[PDB]
Design a protein around this ligand. Structure first.
Ligand SMILES: Cc1cccc([N+](=O)[O-])c1
Ligand SMILES: [Zn+2]
Length: 257
């Protein structure tokens, strides 16, 4: 099945998921010189004070930190969005080396990693219904650069030994995702897709301009994870990023001058 090797990576996905060659695929390169400032965009409203993390899972593609999304406890609103979007999970994409790992790029620059906070539109009732709608999801994307440690990331890093291989989970309560945000909420936005199969064109992307800093040590721990299951040949979970896709007939809008 699909993955990030030579034989099963991004360049193969279209055979099982033809929407891979669609009109609104993600990620994309963000050309900062052609993204136009849109004064009509609102500030983003990130309301995570009541968030309830539950569990962390290695799904064989990344690790997901999952939240209780049975009520409006951690929500994203404002920005480019109409309505209310509930946080379901976050996860990262990262590289084998610090010079690659992000999915979005900025003037062709690749960051060491990218965080995706995934939210679904409450008007559709559940996640599975939301991903069938063009405005079903809002994903907040945050770039990671290597420098100073991110203190708020360390709780995640330190549990990763317990979910080394595909299908392992661990309890992961009381984690505050506010500790993963940069200072500024300035953003770019465009309409796109999930970046993994099934590649559904259901996402309003909100990509923050300001990266967070993580330490080399932190990212090194991500790279100790495995794609494989327990007692299978070890294949390090690295380079779990889809490259930039054609922008096609889209505009990327900036919230800031
Ligand atoms: C399959 C799946 C599920 C949730 C989120 C994403 N995504 O952001 O690519 C993909
Ligand atoms: Zn992602």
């Amino acid at each position: 099945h699909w993955g990030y090797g030579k034989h099963n990576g991004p360049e193969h996905w279209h055979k099982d998921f033809p929407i891979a060659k669609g009109e609104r695929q993600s990620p994309v390169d963000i050309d900062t010189h052609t993204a136009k400032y849109d004064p009509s965009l609102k500030p983003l409203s990130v309301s995570y004070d009541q968030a309830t993390s539950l569990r962390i899972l290695n799904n064989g593609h990344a690790f997901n930190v999952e939240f209780d999304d049975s009520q409006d406890k951690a929500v994203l609103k404002g920005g480019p969005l109409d309505g209310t979007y509930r946080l379901i999970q976050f996860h990262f994409h990262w590289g084998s080396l610090d010079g690659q790992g992000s999915e979005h790029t900025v003037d062709k620059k690749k960051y060491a990693a990218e965080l995706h906070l995934v939210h679904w539109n409450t008007k559709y009732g559940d996640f599975g219904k939301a991903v069938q709608q063009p405005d079903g999801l809002a994903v907040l994307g945050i770039f990671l650069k290597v420098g100073s440690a991110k203190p708020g990331l360390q709780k995640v890093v330190d549990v990763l030994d317990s979910i080394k291989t595909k299908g392992k989970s661990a309890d992961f309560t009381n984690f505050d995702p506010r500790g993963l945000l940069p200072e500024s909420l300035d953003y770019w936005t465009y309409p796109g897709s999930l970046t993994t199969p099934p590649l559904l064109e259901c996402v309003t992307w909100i990509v923050l301009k300001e990266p967070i800093s993580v330490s080399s040590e932190q990212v090194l721990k991500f790279r100790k994870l495995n794609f494989n299951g327990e007692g299978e040949p070890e294949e390090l979970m690295v380079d779990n990023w889809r490259p930039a896709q054609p922008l096609k007939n889209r505009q990327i809008k900036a919230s800031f001058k």
